[PDB]
C-alpha cells in the first residue's frame, strides 16, 4: 500500500515517545539491540542454534544494568562470561571458539555496551539531553550530506568505506551547533527542562561529528570483512539496523563523557 | 629463584589502594603483551594496544573513579588507531577482535580487584587472589589421586569434576584459617562465615572456565603456552587465566552478601 513512506513516517515519532519514561528508554534500547546484534552476530554465524543465544545475551544487558544491578560492570562481565561458557559447549572446535567469542566480543562492547549509554545519559542528564544526543546524529548525517554534495574534497574515507570528506564533517558540525539554540531555548523557553549549557555546545558537536565519522568507517571495515555492502536485512528503509545506528554508537559514550565533564549533576 | 621472591612482592602491593593499581597495571602490561602479540608480530601495532590495556586501571581508579567511561575511551581509541594503521579492512577486524577479547577478559576483568579493594577491604582483596593459588594446589593433589569423571574437552589439558571439588573444599577450609586468623588477629573485616560456600564455588567454577577458555584461546593461536615473559614454566596470561573469571564473579557475590564498607 505505497509502503516506504507510509512507514518511514511512522518511525521518527515512535522513538521519541519512548523517551517518556526511563523504563521506556530501556525498552527501545533492548529492542534496538535485538535487531542490531542479530545482524552483527549473524554475519559470523549462520547456525540455527548459535546466533540466537548470544543475541539474547546482547539484548539482556540494558535491563540488567538499569533495573537489576543499577551498576554496569557486573552484567557486562556476566554476559561475557556466560558467552564464553556457552561457546565452549557448542563449538567443539577450539580455534573456532575464538571466532565466535571475537564476534560476540566486538558485539558486546560496540553494540550493547555503547548503545546502552543512553541509560546513564538519561538518568544522569535528563531525557531532554538524551533525546538531543540521538537526534544530533540524525541531523549530522543530513547537514553533512548537503554540504557534502556541494563542498567537494579533501576526503578522509578510504577505499572500503563509502565517501566522507573533512569539509563534509565540518558542515554537519556546524549544523549541530546551530541545531542547538533551537533545541536549547525551544526546550528551555518552552519548558524549564534543563539542557546543555550554551558553553558545552562546541564539544558536543565536535564529538557528534568526529565520533559519527569513526563509527561509520569502523562499520564499513566491519562490513567489508564479512563481505557485505549492507549490515543485515531486518529493516524496510534501505540499509539495515546496525547501519542506521553505527555512528551513533561511538557518539553516545564519548558524548556522555563530555556531559559528565561539563554539566555536573542534574538528576 | 623466581618462586621465592614473587609471592611476598604481590602481597606487599596490597598495602595501599594506589599500590594495587600499580600491580594491576603492571600485571596487565605483561598479560596483554602476550595475548596481543599472538595476533600481531608487527613492531608498531602490538605496543599501542598493549599500552591501552594497561592504562585502564589508572584511569578507572584515579581519574574517572568510574569504570564505563575509560573502557569506552580505550576501545574507541583502539578502533580509531586500527583504522589508521591496518589499511586492509578485513584485517582491521582481526586486530580489533583480538584487542576486544583482550580488553574484556584481561583488562576489564583483572581490574576487578580495584572495586573489590575499596568496596570490600584489601583483606578480602588478598583473599580472592590467594584462593585461586590454593584452588590450583588442592585440585592438583586431589586430582592426581582421584581420577575420572572428566569435565575438560579435547583441546584443553585434563580436568575432572572430582578434581574441582577438592579445590572447592580446600578453599572452604582455607578460609576459617584466613577468617579468624585475620579477625582474631586484627579487626579487619573479612567475608562472613555464611558467604563461604558461594565464594568457594565461584573460585572453583570460574577458575575452571577461565583455564579452559585460555586453552581454547591458546590452541587457536597454536601454542601450548601463552607467551614467554616469565621465568617459572608458563607465561603471564597462563598464571592469571582462571583468576580472571573468578574475580568479577566473586565481586558480584560479595556485593550481594557483604553489603557496604563505612
Ligand atoms: Hg515508543
Ligand atoms: Hg548554562
Ligand atoms: Hg562498506
Ligand atoms: Hg609490591
Ligand atoms: Hg558475619
Ligand atoms: Hg591448550
Ligand atoms: K557504514
Ligand atoms: K588455560
Ligand atoms: Mg551512521
Ligand atoms: Mg589458572
Instruction: Determine the Cα angle at A96 with ends A92 and A98, to 5°.
Output: 115
Mutation choice for A interface testing from B35, B67, B101 by most A CBs within 10 A: B101
Q: Could you tell me how many CB contacts below 8 A there are between chain A and chain B?
A: 131
What is the per-residue burial (b if ≥16 Cβ within 10 Å, else e) of B57-95?
Answer: bbbbbeebebbbbbbbbbbbbbbbbbbebbeebeebbbb
Provide CB contacts within 8 A for A41, sequence distance 6+. Answer: A51, A54, A55, A58, A103, A104, A107
3-state secondary structure (DSSP) of residue A155: strand
Element (H, E) at A198: none
A252: left (phi over 0), alpha (psi -120 to 50) or beta: alpha
Nearest CA-CA distance, residue B5 and chain A, Å: 33
Terminal alpha carbon distance of chain A = 45
Residue closest to A106 by CA, chosen among A27, A221, A244: A221
A165 forms beta bridges with A155
Residue with C-alpha cell 525498552? A27
Angle, helices A201-226 vs A118-151, to 10°: value is: 80
Nearest CA-CA distance, residue A190 and chain B, Å: 32
**Contact between A81 and B206 using a beta-carbon 8 Å cutoff:** yes
Nearest CA-CA distance, residue B7 and chain A, Å: 28
With contact defined as beta carbons under 8 Å apart, do A231 and A241 qualify? yes
Query: In chain B, whose CA is at the least distance from the CA of A227?
Result: B90
Element (H, E) at B145: helix B113-146
**Contact between A225 and B83 using a beta-carbon 8 Å cutoff:** no
Q: Where are the beta strands (DSSP E) in B53-155?
A: none
| CA atoms lying within 13 Å on the CB side of residue B81 | 18
Q: Is B68 an 8 Å CB contact of chain A? A: yes
Residue closest to A100 by CA, chosen among A144, A47, A148: A47
Residue closest to A125 by CA, chosen among A256, A248, A12: A256
Residue closest to A118 by CA, chosen among A223, A240, A215, A21: A21
Pull the grid cell for residue B152: 575438560
CA of B244 to the centre of ligand 6 (A): 17
CA of B225 to the centre of ligand 6 (A): 8
Provide CB contacts within 8 A for B256, sequence distance 6+. Answer: none
CA of B132 to the centre of ligand 4 (A): 19
CA of B18 to the centre of ligand 4 (A): 11
In terms of Cβ atoms closer than 10 Å to its own Cβ (0-12, 13-18, 19+), residue A207 is: buried
With contact defined as beta carbons under 8 Å apart, do A72 and B108 qualify? no
What is the per-residue burial (b if ≥16 Cβ within 10 Å, else e) of A54-76?
Answer: bbebbbbbbbbbbeebebbbbbb
With contact defined as beta carbons under 8 Å apart, do B115 and A73 qualify? yes
Distance, C-alpha A197 to centroid of its chain: 24
Contact residues on chain B for A79, CB-CB shorter than 8 A = none
Return residues 140-199 of B near A (CB < 8 Å): 153-155
Query: What one-character DSSP code corresponds to residue B160?
Result: B
With contact defined as beta carbons under 8 Å apart, do A208 and A248 qualify? no
With contact defined as beta carbons under 8 Å apart, do A24 and A18 qualify? yes
Pull the grid cell for residue B113: 580487584
Pull the grid cell for residue B102: 583482550
Query: What one-character DSSP code corresponds to residue B63?
Result: I
Terminal alpha carbon distance of chain B = 42
Other C-beta atoms lying within 10 Å of the C-beta of residue B225:
13
What DSSP assignment string belongs to A116-149? TTHHHHHHHHHHHHHHHHHHHHHHHHHHHHHHHH
Q: How far apart are CA A178 and CA A157, in angstroms?
A: 25
User: How many residues does this entry show for chain B?
Assistant: 262
- Residue B239 phi/psi, 5-degree rounding, is -65, -50
Domain boundaries, chain A: 1-267
Q: How far apart are CA B132 and CA B140, in angstroms?
A: 12
Residue closest to B237 by CA, chosen among B210, B197, B258: B210
Q: Is B96 an 8 Å CB contact of chain A? A: yes
Pull the grid cell for residue B216: 581454547
Taking the CA atoms of residue B79, residue B84, residue B88 and residue B92 in that order, the dihedral angle to the nearest 10 degrees is -10
Resolution in angstroms comes to 3.4
What DSSP assignment string belongs to A27-59? HHHHHHHHHHHHHHHHTT---SHHHHHHHHHHH
**Contact between A72 and B73 using a beta-carbon 8 Å cutoff:** no
Distance, C-alpha B76 to centroid of its chain: 23
- Nearest CB to B220 within list A94, A105, A257: A94
With contact defined as beta carbons under 8 Å apart, do B162 and B208 qualify? no
**Contact between B216 and A97 using a beta-carbon 8 Å cutoff:** yes
Q: How far apart are CA A75 and CA A68, in angstroms?
A: 9
Q: Is A262 an 8 Å CB contact of chain B? A: no
CA of B145 to the centre of ligand 8 (A): 21
- Residue B187 phi/psi, 5-degree rounding, is -80, 65
Q: How far apart are CA B40 and CA B20, in angstroms?
A: 29
Nearest CA-CA distance, residue B67 and chain A, Å: 7
- Residue B160 phi/psi, 5-degree rounding, is -120, 150
3-state secondary structure (DSSP) of residue A7: coil
Return residues 9-38 of B near A (CB < 8 Å): none
User: What experimental approach yielded this model?
Assistant: X-ray
**Contact between B216 and A74 using a beta-carbon 8 Å cutoff:** no
Amino acid at each position: 500500500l505505497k509502503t516506504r513512506v507510509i512507514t518511514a513516517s511512522v518511525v521518527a515519532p515512535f522513538v521519541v515517545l519512548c523517551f517518556v519514561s526511563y523504563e521506556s528508554l530501556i525498552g527501545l534500547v533492548s529492542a534496538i539491540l535485538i535487531l542490531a546484534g542479530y545482524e552483527l552476530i549473524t554475519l559470523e554465524m549462520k547456525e540455527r542454534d548459535a546466533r540466537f543465544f548470544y543475541v539474547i545475551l546482547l539484548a539482556l544487558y540494558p535491563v540488567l544494568y538499569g533495573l537489576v544491578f543499577e551498576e554496569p560492570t557486573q552484567p557486562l562481565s556476566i554476559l561475557f562470561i556466560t558467552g564464553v561458557v556457552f561457546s565452549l559447549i557448542t563449538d567443539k572446535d577450539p580455534s573456532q571458539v575464538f571466532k565466535t567469542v571475537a564476534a560476540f566480543s566486538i558485539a558486546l562492547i560496540y553494540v550493547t555496551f555503547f548503545l546502552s549509554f543512553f541509560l546513564p545519559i538519561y538518568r544522569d542528564f535528563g531525557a531532554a539531553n538524551a533525546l538531543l544526543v540521538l537526534t544530533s546524529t540524525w541531523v549530522f548525517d543530513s547537514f553533512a550530506y548537503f554540504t557534502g554534495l556541494k563542498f567537494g574534497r579533501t576526503r578522509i574515507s578510504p577505499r572500503y568505506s563509502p565517501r566522507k570528506s573533512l569539509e563534509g564533517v565540518i558542515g554537519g558540525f556546524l549544523g549541530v551547533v546551530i541545531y542547538t539554540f533551537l533545541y536549547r531555548l525551544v526546550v528551555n523557553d518552552l519548558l524549564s527542562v534543563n539542557v546543555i549549557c550554551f558553553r558545552t555546545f562546541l564539544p558536543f558537536a565536535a564529538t557528534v561529528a568526529i565520533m559519527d565519522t569513526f563509527g561509520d568507517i569502523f562499520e564499513c571495515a566491519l562490513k567489508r570483512h564479512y563481505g557485505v555492502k549492507d549490515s543485515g536485512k531486518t529493516l524496510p528503509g534501505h540499509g539495515g539496523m546496525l547501519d542506521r545506528i553505527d555512528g551513533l554508537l561511538f557518539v553516545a559514550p564519548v558524548s556522555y563523557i563530555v556531559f559528565k565533564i561539563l554539566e555536573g549533576v542534574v538528576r
